[PDB]
């Protein structure tokens, strides 16, 4: 169910990935603070994979308390020919947030598992 997009020392981004129809996936993304200090000003930025429309709904919040699991949730969907062809979909993403003392960035390109 929960696939890991990224795990740093301060933050775990993971997600559920479901197929709603023949042309549409649903991503429920969750952000977890695994540090003993609060995380503020969180934001995830995404690009749309090559054969795909990406619909990104707003995040539930932008703050994460110390040792908070799933403190922010964010819904997305993925649609288009690449979802239909059962091709591998690569998600380019970037996050910014502030912890105490630092302003941090994390970024990657992650392949999403099978339709």
- The torsion angle over the Cα atoms of residues 28, 113, 47 and 27, rounded to 10 degrees, is -10
Q: 25 burial class (0-12, 13-18, 19+ CB within 10 angstroms)?
A: buried
Number of Cβ within a 10 Å radius of residue 22:
8
List of residues 6+ apart from 45 with CB closer than 8 A? 93, 94, 95, 96
Provide the experimental method for this PDB entry: X-ray
Query: Locate tokens 């995380």: which residue?
Result: 39
Give the residue from 15, 44, 32, 30 showing the smallest Cα distance to 113: 15
Q: In what order do the strands lie in the sheet with 89-99?
A: 40-46, 89-99, 102-112
Resolution (A): 2.2
Does residue 10 sit in helix, strand or coil?
Answer: coil
Q: Which of 34, 9, 29 is nearest to 18 (CA)?
A: 29
Residue that the structure tokens 């690569």 belong to: 90
Q: Which among 31, 28, 7 is positioned nearest to 17, based on CA atoms?
A: 28
Contact 83, 34 (CB under 8 A): no
Domains and CATH numbers, the chain: 1-115 (2.60.40.1230)
**Interatomic CA distance for residues 99 and 93, integer angstroms:** 19
3-state secondary structure 32-65: EECCCCCEEEEEEEECCCCCCEEEECCCCCCCEC
């Amino acid at each position: 169910q929960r696939h890991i997009l990224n795990q740093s020392d301060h933050l775990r981004i993971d997600y559920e990935l479901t197929r709603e129809s023949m042309t549409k996936l649903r991503l429920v993304i969750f952000y977890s603070n695994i540090s003993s200090d609060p995380i503020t000003n969180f934001a995830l930025l995404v690009a749309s994979p090559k054969g795909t429309t990406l619909s990104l709904q707003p995040q539930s919040g932008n703050m994460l308390q110390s040792n908070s699991r799933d403190g922010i949730k964010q819904i997305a969907s993925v649609e288009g020919i690449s979802v239909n062809l059962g091709k591998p979909i690569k998600l380019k993403w970037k996050a910014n947030y502030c912890t105490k003392g630092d302003s941090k960035e994390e970024s990657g390109t992650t392949s999403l598992p099978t339709i």
